[PDB]
Amino acid sequence: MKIGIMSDTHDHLPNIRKAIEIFNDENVETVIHCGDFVSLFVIKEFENLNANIIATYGNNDGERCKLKEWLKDINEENIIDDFISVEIDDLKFFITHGHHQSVLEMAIKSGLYDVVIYGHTHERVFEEVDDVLVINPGECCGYLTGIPTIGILDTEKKEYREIVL
Numbered sequence: 001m002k003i004g005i006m007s008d009t010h011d012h013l014p015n016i017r018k019a020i021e022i023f024n025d026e027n028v029e030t031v032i033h034c035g036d037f038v039s040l041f042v043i044k045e046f047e048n049l050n051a052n053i054i055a056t057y058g059n060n061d062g063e064r065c066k067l068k069e070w071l072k073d074i075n076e077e078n079i080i081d082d083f084i085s086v087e088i089d090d091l092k093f094f095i096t097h098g099h100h101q102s103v104l105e106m107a108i109k110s111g112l113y114d115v116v117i118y119g120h121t122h123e124r125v126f127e128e129v130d131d132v133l134v135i136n137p138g139e140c141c142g143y144l145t146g147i148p149t150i151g152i153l154d155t156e157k158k159e160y161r162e163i164v165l
């Protein structure tokens, strides 16, 4: 019943592994990654991730179709689009790389989802803005802010918390 959240891994292999371990060692049914993986080899490291993967395309993600195939050879369930609007554990999700703010803003203001997830900015935030649970797990790589993070969301109690690496 635990969903893993992460973003902007920017090829940092170490922190990527540290997150892939932290996730396994827990429930974590699925892992949302809205970030810029940035390079194809990042996808191999994930072959070691127990849960499945719902990813979004970061704007730096060059190999757009290679990433998709690869993510699948790793698992048929794994999905990756520019925008993913799904329902999970009886909850409406809108996931996207922080990329396009206009669409992000409207997903929140709209009132069609319960939970909204994005990244891009590298600034982790965790706020409730009109019933909407808005989450940016921050930068797994820790490059711009120097604070490397990821996060786990409780789909049951609607509870969440950051994890520093």
Ligand SMILES: [Mn+2]
Residues within 6 Å of the ligand: 036, 058, 059, 060, 097, 120, 121
């Ligand atoms: Mn970005």
Ligand SMILES: [Mn+2]
Residues within 6 Å of the ligand: 008, 036, 058, 060, 120
């Ligand atoms: Mn980025």
